[PDB]
Design a protein around this nucleic acid. Sequence first.
RNA 1: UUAAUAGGGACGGUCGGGGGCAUCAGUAUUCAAUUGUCAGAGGUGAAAUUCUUGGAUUUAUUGAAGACUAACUACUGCGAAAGCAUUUGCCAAGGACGUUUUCAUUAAUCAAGAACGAAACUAUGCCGACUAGGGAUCGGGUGGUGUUUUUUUAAUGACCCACUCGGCACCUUACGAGAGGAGUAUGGUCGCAAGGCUGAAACUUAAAGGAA
Lengths: 119, 61, 124, 141, 210
Amino acid sequence: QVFGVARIYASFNDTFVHVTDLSGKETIARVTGGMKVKADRDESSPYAAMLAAQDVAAKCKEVGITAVHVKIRATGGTRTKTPGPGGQAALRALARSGLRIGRIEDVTPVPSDSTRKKG
Amino acid sequence: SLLPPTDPFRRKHEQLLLDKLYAMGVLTTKSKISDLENKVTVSAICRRRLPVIMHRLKMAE
Amino acid sequence: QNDLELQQFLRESHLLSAFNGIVYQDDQVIGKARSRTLEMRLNRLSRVNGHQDKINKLEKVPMHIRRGMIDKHVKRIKKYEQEAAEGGIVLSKVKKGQFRKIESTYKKDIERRIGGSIKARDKE
Amino acid sequence: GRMHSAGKGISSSAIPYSRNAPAWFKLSSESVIEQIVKYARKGLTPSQIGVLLRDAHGVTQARVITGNKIMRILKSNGLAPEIPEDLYYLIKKAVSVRKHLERNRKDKDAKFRLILIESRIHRLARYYRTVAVLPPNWKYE
Amino acid sequence: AEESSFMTLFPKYRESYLKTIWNDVTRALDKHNIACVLDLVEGSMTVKTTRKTYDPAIILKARDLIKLLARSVPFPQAVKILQDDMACDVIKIGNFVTNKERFVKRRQRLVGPNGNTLKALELLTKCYILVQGNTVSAMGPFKGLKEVRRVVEDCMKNIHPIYHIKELMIKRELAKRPELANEDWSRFLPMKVYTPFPPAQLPRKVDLEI
RNA sequence: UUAAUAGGGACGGUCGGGGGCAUCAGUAUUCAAUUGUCAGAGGUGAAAUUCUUGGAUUUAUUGAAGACUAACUACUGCGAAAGCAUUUGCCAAGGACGUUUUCAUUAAUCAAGAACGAAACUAUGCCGACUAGGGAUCGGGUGGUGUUUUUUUAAUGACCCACUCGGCACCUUACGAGAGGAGUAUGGUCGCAAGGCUGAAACUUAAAGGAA
Ligand SMILES: [Mg+2]
Ligand SMILES: [Mg+2]
Ligand SMILES: [Mg+2]
Ligand SMILES: [Mg+2]
Ligand SMILES: [Mg+2]
Ligand SMILES: [Mg+2]
Ligand SMILES: [Mg+2]
Ligand SMILES: [Mg+2]
Ligand SMILES: [Mg+2]
Ligand SMILES: [Mg+2]
């Protein structure tokens, strides 16, 4: 069972589905909601994320990977820490496509102390 | 009354009810819709019974 | 501050939520929310010029019922405030005599019976 | 009750009602006087002398045991301070803060506390000048 | 297939209400084949997947559910988090201002008189909003959550929320008019050097006589 | 002469997100260097603007810069107020408590004077020289008790209970001379204002519009 790492970045306005090797240095397939939809309003939709995950999952099967560890994240920083709708739909699509899901973790960038002025 | 005041359905049905009741004689006037609540009484209906109308026509003392 | 529609919606938000996009427009609103909203508006206008005793009158209720109704309502408020206090929830400020207006206030039409406050204690 | 502070503490000593020496105390009065003189010669202040005698020598109060206060006992034997002990410590504290303000010129808090200390010196110095314990010409720094 | 689990601590005051509802929580999670545990000794609630679990992402929603229950959100309201549309957001407000009184008054502004401002925002955004301490926890659809964040942050920067409530009402009527979809809606929207040493004190009248 | 449940100073173990100067750490943001892949990425209700096959966004490793000090964070603590939240060290300062230590009225309130020092936008509480309380909490002290703890290396706490002093608040109680709004009307004053298609009047006048 060859394992990859599925890095999903679910923003309110877009969703990235990115699968890489365990080190993360080697990109295998990066697909985005914007590439799988025709209008700018539907990039964040669950549907656009669903198409992106299916495209990635097929490519992962081509190279040889059969399982992936999921590392979902939100925009983080000073902005929202909550993943958008696409991330949840993308995670489902990978399973239905057949790839085994190994581990799911939330790796949103959480600042200790933001760059926000009290004044 | 709980339908919105400008509703055409509300205005139509309230008028039909006012038309029908006035024709029966239960209601003396057709001007106000609040009469359907305040002035609709058993006494109004009893006041259209044959003995009472005979009395008001002075056919009986 | 002088926008009648905006200010009306804010004051009437509690009734509309209890008796339910949200239909806040006058043409759209129907049902109990319409009857309660019209009464709420008419009381507000009448408060300026109408005498306090005449404008608002608590519906006649026996003592042993009304005293029971007040006791249970106050208990609900204390539970609501304690639960918010033990948590972090921030609650709207209420004057000392008046009862806080919890969600049960709007649904149950409690105020028409028990009233905003106990007038006997306010007078003294 | 504190001046220059909002504290209202009441911590203090409660002098016992009886004014005669404890029955268990069985040391000569003269011996206590010599102990007082020795400590003063070493450089201990009257406040510190009473602590040592009370803690380790059973002298509950110098006045009760010997009939005279520590200050009068020392003065009878030629030992007397330049300036009253409470005034001596107020001046030393003012010096230490002024030294600190020299190295740290941004410590506005220390500047505020110095005003309170110098104010205490002026009130205390004025009292001693009135009683003639301190010479009339004496001025702080 | 290793088991993914999440655990959340809850305050002791919240224990009594969790005990009553845990059957309902168990029943709701069983519909998704998610197992849960309530540890009253440690004061923790745990959610864990099972071998029958089929939805890979449900555990993330189950984790959010137990977090909401720990933060005093009632279960009938919180259980909506399991739905796909609903999401939960927590907005920090402690870092916007440095004056305590200015912090308190602006926070009350978010609640409004009698809670009128908060209720109006919930109705327009379809979100459950709860203002706690130095944070605002909001739950609801993603479009609503985005709006709530703007109002809450703007409130702490001296923009009265009543402007945002008006703006949301106008934007909603415009959303129902197809002709102005393309055109910009902005026109409809409402618009000597420091010295370390103190100066000397003025001597008292008695001091002059001395 | 007392040694004020007046005031000051002293000493003891403490308490603190009090102040100044150094020092340490943290993820985040921006920028930069490499690094895999390739067509969009941010943003909006839509856009516009901005970046991008010279590789943007995203991924991994690394470095630098400025700011900040999340969660723990409390109707809690410290400070005269404004204010103060990472570690360690130094410099002075401070509160309360404990004292059978010391001075002996040195005090209280204070106009003048001296030190420090975009915003608001729904609120609100009878007041006082004034009684008795209740629950909880912070710091100190005394006593009891038995669990954590532990043993001749030095240090040596946490919890429970009662009492007590001093704080931040909450909830109750006894006592007290504490001495215009909302409208209506107008033979007045001052302004603002009606109409008849435009062209088009000294011209019954073109083209083109308006209405129909
Ligand atoms: Mg002192
Ligand atoms: Mg005394
Ligand atoms: Mg000391
Ligand atoms: Mg310190
Ligand atoms: Mg320091
Ligand atoms: Mg700092
Ligand atoms: Mg603390
Ligand atoms: Mg304080
Ligand atoms: Mg920290
Ligand atoms: Mg106390």
